[PDB]
Design an enzyme around this catalytic site. Structure first.
Site, PDB file in Angstrom:
ATOM      1  N   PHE A 137      -6.453   4.854   7.090  1.00 29.89           N
ATOM      2  CA  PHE A 137      -5.583   3.639   7.772  1.00 29.89           C
ATOM      3  C   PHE A 137      -6.555   2.854   8.651  1.00 29.89           C
ATOM      4  CE2 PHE A 137      -2.237   6.944   6.753  1.00 29.89           C
ATOM      5  CZ  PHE A 137      -1.417   5.985   6.341  1.00 29.89           C
ATOM      6  N   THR A 178       0.889  -1.245   0.012  1.00 29.97           N
ATOM      7  CA  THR A 178      -0.042  -0.073  -0.065  1.00 29.97           C
ATOM      8  C   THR A 178       0.861   1.434   0.083  1.00 29.97           C
ATOM      9  OG1 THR A 178      -0.225  -0.606   2.375  1.00 29.97           O
ATOM     10  CG2 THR A 178      -2.045  -1.020   0.935  1.00 29.97           C
ATOM     11  N   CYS A 210      -4.528   0.839  11.364  1.00 31.33           N
ATOM     12  CA  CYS A 210      -3.123   0.515  10.872  1.00 31.33           C
ATOM     13  C   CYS A 210      -2.173   0.694  11.986  1.00 31.33           C
ATOM     14  CB  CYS A 210      -2.698   1.390   9.485  1.00 31.33           C
ATOM     15  SG  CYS A 210      -1.092   1.059   8.995  1.00 31.33           S
TER      16      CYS A 210
HETATM   17  C1  HEM Z   1      -0.033   4.225   3.169  1.00 31.99           C
HETATM   18  C2  HEM Z   1       0.481   2.929   3.348  1.00 31.99           C
HETATM   19  C3  HEM Z   1      -0.978   2.061   4.374  1.00 31.99           C
HETATM   20  C4  HEM Z   1      -2.191   1.875   4.099  1.00 31.99           C
HETATM   21  C5  HEM Z   1      -3.284   2.854   3.197  1.00 31.99           C
HETATM   22  C6  HEM Z   1      -2.441   1.075   5.160  1.00 31.99           C
HETATM   23  C7  HEM Z   1      -3.911   0.885   5.646  1.00 31.99           C
HETATM   24  C8  HEM Z   1      -4.505   0.041   6.614  1.00 31.99           C
HETATM   25  C9  HEM Z   1      -5.754  -0.295   6.964  1.00 31.99           C
HETATM   26  C10 HEM Z   1      -6.891   0.400   6.281  1.00 31.99           C
HETATM   27  C11 HEM Z   1      -5.783  -1.134   7.945  1.00 31.99           C
HETATM   28  C12 HEM Z   1      -7.025  -1.599   8.433  1.00 31.99           C
HETATM   29  C13 HEM Z   1      -7.680  -2.916   7.865  1.00 31.99           C
HETATM   30  C14 HEM Z   1      -8.923  -3.371   8.346  1.00 31.99           C
HETATM   31  O1  HEM Z   1      -9.682  -2.751   9.238  1.00 31.99           O
HETATM   32  O2  HEM Z   1      -9.334  -4.555   7.701  1.00 31.99           O
HETATM   33  C15 HEM Z   1      -4.424  -1.490   8.344  1.00 31.99           C
HETATM   34  C16 HEM Z   1      -4.022  -2.395   9.227  1.00 31.99           C
HETATM   35  C17 HEM Z   1      -2.687  -2.895   9.411  1.00 31.99           C
HETATM   36  N1  HEM Z   1      -1.736  -2.336   8.889  1.00 31.99           N
HETATM   37 FE1  HEM Z   1      -1.597  -0.632   7.650  1.00 31.99          FE
HETATM   38  N2  HEM Z   1      -1.524   0.565   5.734  1.00 31.99           N
HETATM   39  C18 HEM Z   1      -0.503   1.116   5.481  1.00 31.99           C
HETATM   40  C19 HEM Z   1       0.733   0.698   5.687  1.00 31.99           C
HETATM   41  C20 HEM Z   1       1.274  -0.009   6.501  1.00 31.99           C
HETATM   42  C21 HEM Z   1       2.817  -0.443   6.974  1.00 31.99           C
HETATM   43  C22 HEM Z   1       3.769   0.181   6.177  1.00 31.99           C
HETATM   44  C23 HEM Z   1       2.617  -1.445   7.782  1.00 31.99           C
HETATM   45  C24 HEM Z   1       3.619  -2.152   8.344  1.00 31.99           C
HETATM   46  C25 HEM Z   1       5.042  -1.372   8.971  1.00 31.99           C
HETATM   47  C26 HEM Z   1       1.175  -1.605   7.978  1.00 31.99           C
HETATM   48  C27 HEM Z   1       0.740  -2.916   8.929  1.00 31.99           C
HETATM   49  C28 HEM Z   1      -0.736  -3.012   9.077  1.00 31.99           C
HETATM   50  C29 HEM Z   1      -1.094  -3.995  10.270  1.00 31.99           C
HETATM   51  C30 HEM Z   1      -0.170  -5.179  10.958  1.00 31.99           C
HETATM   52  C31 HEM Z   1      -2.428  -3.809  10.357  1.00 31.99           C
HETATM   53  C32 HEM Z   1      -3.332  -4.719  11.170  1.00 31.99           C
HETATM   54  C33 HEM Z   1      -3.350  -3.862  12.647  1.00 31.99           C
HETATM   55  C34 HEM Z   1      -4.146  -4.729  13.437  1.00 31.99           C
HETATM   56  O3  HEM Z   1      -5.357  -4.959  13.351  1.00 31.99           O
HETATM   57  O4  HEM Z   1      -3.785  -4.841  14.740  1.00 31.99           O
HETATM   58  N3  HEM Z   1       0.289  -0.843   7.324  1.00 31.99           N
HETATM   59  N4  HEM Z   1      -3.713  -0.725   7.333  1.00 31.99           N
END
Ligand code: HEM
Ligand SMILES: CCCCCCCCCCCCCCCC(=O)NCC(=O)O
Length: 456
Positions: free
Chosen positions: A391, A266, A398
């Site tokens: 996010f 992403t 996130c």
């Molecule tokens: C601009 C880039 C990114 C976007 C748009 C993004 C977006 C999101 C979104 C929308 C969710 C929630 C998903 C849901 O509710 O089903 C999420 C969860 C998550 N993201 Fe990101 N993310 C980004 C970058 C990252 C990066 C760089 C990492 C790791 C260093 C990361 C790790 C995670 C993890 C591990 C979760 C799950 C958190 C949890 O439920 O405990 N994300 N992200």
């Protein structure tokens, strides 16, 4: 009084399912939302969900006392390889809060400052690649952004070098990840997933999952044969303060796969869309380039300087507004409840938040929602709660948001400092979908400003 919910066209016994038989399902759903409004029901044999597009309804969906994170069909398919890692675990599974507590420290301000140097290492490789292109050449944007983001999460998080800039073809892990995500997306429209017609799809899926796991094996082995204190250090040794327990080997493998994918895909999409919008809006590009030149006064950027790239940050938030790269998230009703005072829901009922639509709610942003205007984020704190959600939400938001934004701000700042960009083909936006979103075929030419780059 309850209101009948709008619903798109049907295909007999298949209901709405065939509407997902397209290589651009999210974009198709956005068009349906434009036609039907803030909420529409979507039925498939044996299941139903409701797509939300307005801030007034999404703000309710984001109330954690009433709704919890749901695994959409897409996440259920991804779980086939991401298991109970953080992205695909249910909030009520022991491993969600346990892994969350063990890994949160890896995204603290102190950890971010510690990642900075390694982020610069990969960013310098990107800048050198472009500085070394010949006059007759051009840049394949999403391709290079993926080289940059995968290498950055690999180095900062696992002290592993994918060495993507040493390859002219996508890295093997990427080829298999993309094919796996594409399969999960294509499986969304399959009415009979076990029809023999999908045996080759299944075989290829298992093969791709094997490739990703073989890589995980190498990362684990290289750490064993190696002193670090990174994400992997915490996965292997960190203890959950609540239970006092560390993660087990199976969950660790799922977290590595999860972070390698969520940790770069992403962000590659974000950088790609940001550069696309910048070249399509010359005046905005000029403002961003002016800030990069004024702020990044040293051979390489310091952590503080990246924090000072306010306008670049605004450009990234505006790109996330128009094209949030993980375009949707799902929720389920914890108990019977009424949505927006008009739509009664039963415990367990599912909702899908269509982020690109939420971000185009004219009652929040004004009528010019299609315009790329970073100035909307001059004072981010003043945007209404739940109007901007690239996010996700609440405790399931996130975990790597600051990591992604620091990386993207650093790299875009360096790009704008070192080159003038040209949309030489007058590129027509073509958004490829693999659950996540990214421009496809976006190319530009970059003319060097010939400013020396400092040592890593
Ligand atoms: C601009 C880039 C990114 C976007 C748009 C993004 C977006 C999101 C979104 C929308 C969710 C929630 C998903 C849901 O509710 O089903 C999420 C969860 C998550 N993201 Fe990101 N993310 C980004 C970058 C990252 C990066 C760089 C990492 C790791 C260093 C990361 C790790 C995670 C993890 C591990 C979760 C799950 C958190 C949890 O439920 O405990 N994300 N992200
Ligand atoms: C292990 C890390 C996994 C990271 C995956 C990130 C992808 C984000 C999901 C974007 C949402 C996909 C939406 C596809 C269209 C849709 O309406 N699907 C309905 C459904 O899946 O139930």
């Amino acid at each position: 009084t309850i209101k009948e919910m709008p619903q798109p066209k049907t295909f007999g016994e298949l209901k709405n399912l065939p509407l997902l038989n397209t290589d651009k399902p999210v974009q198709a759903l956005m068009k349906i939302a434009d036609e039907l409004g803030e909420i529409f029901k979507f039925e498939a044999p044996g299941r139903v969900t409701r797509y939300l597009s307005s801030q007034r309804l999404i703000k309710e969906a984001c109330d954690e006392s009433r709704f919890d994170k749901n695994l959409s069909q897409a996440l259920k398919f991804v779980r086939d390889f991401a298991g109970d890692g953080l992205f695909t675990s249910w909030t009520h599974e022991k491993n969600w809060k346990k892994a969350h507590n063990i890994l949160l420290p890896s995204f603290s301000q102190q950890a971010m400052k510690g990642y900075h140097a390694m982020m610069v290492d990969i960013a310098v490789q990107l800048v050198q690649k472009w500085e070394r292109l010949n006059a007759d050449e051009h840049i394949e944007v999403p391709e290079d952004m993926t080289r940059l983001t995968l290498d950055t999460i690999g180095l900062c998080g696992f002290n592993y070098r994918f060495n993507s800039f040493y390859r002219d073809q996508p890295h093997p892990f990427i080829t298999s990840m993309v094919r796996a995500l594409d399969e999960a997306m294509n499986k969304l429209q399959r009415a009979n997933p076990d029809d023999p017609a999908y045996d080759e799809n299944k075989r290829q899926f298992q093969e791709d999952i094997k490739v990703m796991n073989d890589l995980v094996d190498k990362i684990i082995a290289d750490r064993k044969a190696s002193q670090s204190d990174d994400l992997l250090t915490h996965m292997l040794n960190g203890k959950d303060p609540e239970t006092g327990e560390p993660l087990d080997d199976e969950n660790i493998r799922y977290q590595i796969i999860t972070f390698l994918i969520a940790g770069h895909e992403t962000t590659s999409g974000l950088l790609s869309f940001a550069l696309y919008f910048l070249v399509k809006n010359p005046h905005v590009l000029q403002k961003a380039a002016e800030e990069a030149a004024r702020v990044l006064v040293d051979p390489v950027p310091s952590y503080k300087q990246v924090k000072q790239l306010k306008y670049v940050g605004m450009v990234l938030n505006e790109a996330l507004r128009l094209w949030p790269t993980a375009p949707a998230f799902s929720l389920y009703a914890k108990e019977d409840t009424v949505l927006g005072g008009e739509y009664p829901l039963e415990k367990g009922d599912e909702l899908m938040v269509l982020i690109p639509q939420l971000h185009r709610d004219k009652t929040i942003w004004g009528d010019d929602v299609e315009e790329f205007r970073p100035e909307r984020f001059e004072n981010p704190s003043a945007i209404p709660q739940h109007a901007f959600k690239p996010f996700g939400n609440g405790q399931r938001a996130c975990i790597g948001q600051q990591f992604a934004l620091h990386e993207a701000t650093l790299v875009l700042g360096m790009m704008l400092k070192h080159f003038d960009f040209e949309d030489h083909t007058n590129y027509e936006l073509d958004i490829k979908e693999t659950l996540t979103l990214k421009p496809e075929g976006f190319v530009v030419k970059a003319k060097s400003k010939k400013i020396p780059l400092g040592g890593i």
